[PDB]
Symmetry: C2
Subunit: 412 residues, 2 copies
């Protein structure tokens, strides 16, 4: 994988040149696209910019995020050829910092369950996950140093884990969703994929100019609370293997690790996530569902068909539960600095299964809103396995710091 | 003005057919549109639907709200001829309910300060307000029974007051802002324009399907708390005359009224509203500001050019202040059912002033998120004056009921 921070340093000292950096990505992409299929379209003519901390940095953008110079097809035939007039605010944050929008990465139709044609970089016979399939795969294939994705359920953390890349879903609403196809406005959150926690930090800094992302350093003696989300069902061995590997490394590194169960109110929040997501999806995709029903990809069309009867009443109650869940979650952070849990059910599923994977271990946090970071840990049978690092709402910086601490810990 | 509730009742009993109802609107639009100029576009072929609670009901749509079959030009040359792919969810809520989208109504460029060419229905020498100029003007001129607008500061309540129409800015995020050109995602709220409070209720009931909007009836001996928002400065005579008149009509109607001071924390919220708004505006209109700076309407261009320096730090500080204001504000509602205040600084300004009016008496409530309803009280010099009925967050039904009560109180 390509490191964003690495490129920056090398370019900042004049050791490396922006055009060279960009030329590399163009090469890297051409080197494996026929193998990975992580891009809907690649702008071969894309060139580096003259100034800014991100000059020389190639960025892939999930195709539900508006671009003014390239189509934004939503991973759906309904939007084949569709061309937004403007660039989404998050895209502008990148361009204003000097980034090079190198192409649009694949997304499942309307960022839901329907698999894309993208293949896992580590094993072409497996899925790269969803819905931010291309952003994770392209970064995992060393095609680009950065990529934007989105998460409603687990569309950022899970695919990152599956593809062995670092990634973060910032605190809810920190990054605007303007110009980003909505699935569920109560959940949709923009995310970044990179090589390491550090790369993610430098990215958010460039995009937001927020001091908290400036000079982030690995955390020291982190207070960690491990939650296995029993309420989310049974996990796969490989996943537990990764979590234990991470806990062991962290303890050796000086972290105080303690297992903990989540409040009952949090369990409930995890359970009603689908209610909020699907009820809102019906409003958010009302036009598509009403005028182009049969054109909506199979799986999404099915989940929508099955939920046409969700009511405003049960939806309001679902949101009440969500609020209760957040409140009692904050209390959990009185004792620990971060929570550690699985990033996915296990290794990425074979493409033959026609599944991007179950987001059951990701959804809760998207609803709570806390910042989440995927930390690549190990690989079972060649397929990557990671762990999810979660901090208090609004403390994305500490999440990346601890995620960084953890990365070095695993590096022995 | 055309009453939505009235048309519904007559269509229901069979007294009026949906086709005839829509024909009535096309005609009502034809009759005054040349003198008012409330529509960017009037779809003369728009027909009524056969079923639904809103069959035979024509609705004007503020032009920053996406429509699939008509252009959405955002009141700006930058988006001339811009055609959205999908209808915004709120639009779909109307269509799915059986309504007819009869046209797009004027909006100031990107919903800010730059006046539209629309004229006040009560006196063409005056402003209809803004930024939802056309929606207030069209309903006020008796062209349509309903219209959608938005409010970041006072874009719904103020123009409604100026044009003498009933209107509601529902609780924050109750209506989705998907497909609605964003100015400030922390503030942007969709609102409705109608003849009376009851027409609003019927509109929200059909759009949301929420029971709290079903069977609404005038409130009885409501407990009212009068707030003059001194932090905003003194209001113009006409505005006070209208307020003083509403209090007396209410008291004589059986309601208990009392002057109340707003928590200092709330005053501060009003004060920092501009920071949140302007700071976000810079991210929301990033593409426009960077790629088409000089094409931005003069006034908005000036306010943006003057706030480029706002920082993430002061921004977050303002959001913290806003949240504190929300908490302490809820307290106020433990003693009183609704608050009663001004809708605008006074009567509509003369067009020659090149101003859509000062939003200072509207902005706080948009940040607080409480549902607000404008009640037309009287007219000075032939120009309408209203008062703003405000209920605690999520208590929209009570806001409409009290507004309905007040409407009757004034009819004596």
């Amino acid at each position: 994988m390509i490191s964003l921070a690495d490129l920056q340093r090398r370019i900042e000292t004049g050791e490396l040149s922006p055009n060279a950096a960009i030329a590399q990505s163009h090469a890297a992409i051409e080197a494996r696209e026929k193998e990975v299929h992580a891009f809907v379209r690649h702008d071969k003519s894309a060139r580096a910019q003259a100034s800014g901390p991100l000059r020389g940095i190639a960025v892939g953008i999930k195709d539900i995020i508006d671009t003014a110079n390239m189509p934004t097809e939503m991973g759906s035939e309904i939007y084949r050829g569709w061309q937004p007039r403007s660039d989404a605010p998050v895209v502008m944050m990148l361009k204003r910092a000097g980034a090079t929008i190198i192409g649009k990465t694949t997304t499942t139709a309307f960022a839901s369950r329907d698999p894309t044609a993208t293949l896992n970089p580590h094993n072409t016979g497996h899925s790269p996950g969803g819905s931010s399939a291309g952003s994770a795969a392209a970064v995992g294939a060393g095609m680009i140093p950065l990529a934007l994705g989105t998460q409603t359920g687990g569309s950022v953390i899970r695919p990152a884990a599956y593809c062995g890349t670092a990634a973060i879903k910032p605190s809810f609403r920190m990054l605007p969703t303007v110009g980003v196809k909505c699935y569920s406005w109560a959940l949709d959150t923009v995310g970044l994929f990179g090589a390491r926690a550090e790369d993610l930090a430098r990215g958010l800094l460039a995009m937001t100019g927020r001091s908290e992302f400036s000079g982030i350093v690995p955390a020291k003696a982190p207070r960690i609370g491990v939650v296995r989300q029993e309420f989310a069902g049974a996990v796969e061995p490989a996943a537990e293997q990764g979590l234990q590997a991470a806990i062991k490394a962290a303890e050796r590194a000086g972290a105080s690790v303690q297992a903990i169960d989540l409040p009952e109110a949090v369990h409930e929040a995890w359970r009603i996530h689908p209610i909020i997501q699907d009820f809102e999806a019906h409003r958010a995709l009302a036009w598509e569902f009403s005028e182009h029903h049969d054109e909506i990809a199979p799986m999404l069309r099915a989940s929508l068909d099955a939920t046409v009867g969700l009511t405003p009443k049960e939806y309001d109650e679902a949101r009440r539960i969500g609020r209760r869940g957040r409140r009692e979650l904050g209390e959990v952070f009185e004792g620990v600095d971060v929570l550690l849990t699985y990033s996915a059910p296990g290794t990425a599923p074979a493409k033959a299964l026609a599944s991007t994977g179950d987001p059951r271990y990701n959804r809760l946090w998207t609803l709570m809103g806390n910042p989440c970071v995927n930390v690549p840990v190990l690989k079972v049978g060649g397929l990557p396995i990671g762990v999810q690092v979660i901090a208090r709402f609004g403390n994305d910086a500490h999440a990346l710091a601890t995620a960084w601490f953890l990365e070095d810990a695993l590096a022995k």
